[PDB]
Design a protein around this ligand. Structure first.
Ligand SMILES: CS(=O)(=O)Nc1ccc(CCNC(=O)c2ccc(O)c3nc(-c4ccc(Cl)cc4Cl)[nH]c23)cc1
Length: 350
């Protein structure tokens, strides 16, 4: 166990490096983006996750920045950050020291998925509500995850506390500037995004969150497809054919069009015979073609589907009480304060 000692900068305080050392270093994730390690901090003896990434060098790392601003109880925390290396031309490697969380909605989904069962609705609420709330947070700052997917929804089992991770493909959408295109993922990219948009809002994250809720309600991605265009061929078969009235609102210079003129089969039949009325409705007001027609994270939190969480007797399947689900800050209420008369129930404080 080599006690690796480095120079780190508190992603929380100002900018004043102090020696931090760790150990137990063990890889736990490698791929598309990052080489997420796992380690014990020689001091607190705590658990953490080091997210090793290539440091642009000639430019400023966006992930590190967006990460330093944040500080929401439902978004993996940035403890420290330090640099590493390799060789050749000496590409620098940025190290993000973060809060170690175990499972994920992904690993959790792939589990009930091979048990022909499904995530009990009460858990779905706790996970989704907590996700939508984190969204409500970053978005209030104009930041867009642009990659809300089951894989980046970390979740601590014995707490049912979901923290959003991987802010790599996340950028701050500013109005009056076209964003190219490249981003998000396969099963969780939005329609406008497949129609190659460029003036798309944060509403895209709502669409990715929308899917995840649909997937958790079916035990399989709702809009499969490995090919973008082929994917839409599937979205339509579910939601229905997108009118010029819609394709227009989606923004596209698609002055033309020619796709599967299929007549949709109601959300009451897409979801298994048991899906409760509201979890279906919430999904309907989530998965819509018109970007400016979808629920806003804040409103999503206040969808009837999460009432059970606003009930004085919310019994947590684990035993101990449910996560701090109401400490809404003025910032998260930013988009529509009035909804505080719904989000913070009559028995809440702090
Ligand atoms: C094939 S895939 O699964 O679609 N690819 C893929 C997509 C997204 C991610 C999450 C990004 N990771 C973090 O930032 C990240 C950040 C802070 C953590 O404390 C932490 N703990 C994990 C993790 C836990 C359990 C297991 Cl079994 C595996 C991992 Cl990696 N990831 C993280 C990992 C892999």
């Amino acid at each position: 166990s080599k006690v690796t000692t480095v120079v780190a900068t508190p992603g929380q305080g100002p900018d004043r490096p102090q020696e931090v050392s760790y150990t137990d270093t063990k890889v736990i994730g490698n791929g598309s983006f990052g080489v997420v390690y796992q380690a014990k901090l020689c001091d607190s003896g705590e658990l953490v996750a080091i997210k090793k990434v290539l440091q642009d060098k000639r430019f400023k790392n966006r992930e590190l920045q967006i990460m330093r601003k944040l500080d929401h109880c439902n978004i993996v925390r940035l403890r420290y950050f330090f640099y590493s290396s390799g060789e050749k031309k000496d590409e620098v490697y940025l190290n993000l020291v973060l809060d170690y969380v175990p499972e994920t909605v992904y690993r959790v989904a792939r589990h009930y998925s091979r048990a022909k069962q499904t995530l009990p609705v009460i858990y779905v609420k706790l996970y989704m509500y907590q996700l939508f709330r984190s969204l409500a947070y970053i978005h209030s700052f104009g930041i867009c995850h642009r990659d809300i997917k089951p894989q980046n929804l970390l979740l601590d089992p014995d707490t049912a506390v979901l923290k959003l991770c991987d802010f790599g493909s996340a950028k701050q959408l500013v109005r009056g500037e076209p964003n190219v295109s490249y981003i998000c993922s396969r099963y969780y990219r939005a329609p406008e995004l497949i129609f190659g948009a460029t003036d798309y809002t944060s509403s895209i994250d709502v669409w990715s969150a929308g899917c995840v809720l649909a997937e958790l309600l079916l035990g399989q991605p709702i809009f499969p497809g490995d090919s973008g265009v082929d994917q839409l061929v599937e979205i339509i078969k579910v939601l229905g054919t997108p009118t010029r009235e819609q394709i227009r609102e989606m923004n596209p210079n698609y002055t033309e069009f020619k796709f599967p003129q299929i007549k949709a089969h109601p959300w009451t039949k897409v979801f298994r015979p048991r899906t409760p009325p509201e979890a279906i409705a919430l999904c309907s007001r989530l998965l819509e073609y018109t970007p400016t027609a979808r629920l806003t994270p804040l409103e999503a939190c206040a969808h009837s589907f999460f009432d059970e969480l606003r009930d004085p007797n919310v019994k947590l399947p684990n035993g101990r009480d449910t996560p701090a689900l109401f400490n809404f800050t003025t910032q998260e209420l930013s988009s529509n304060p009035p909804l505080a008369t719904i989000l913070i129930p009559p028995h809440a404080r702090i």
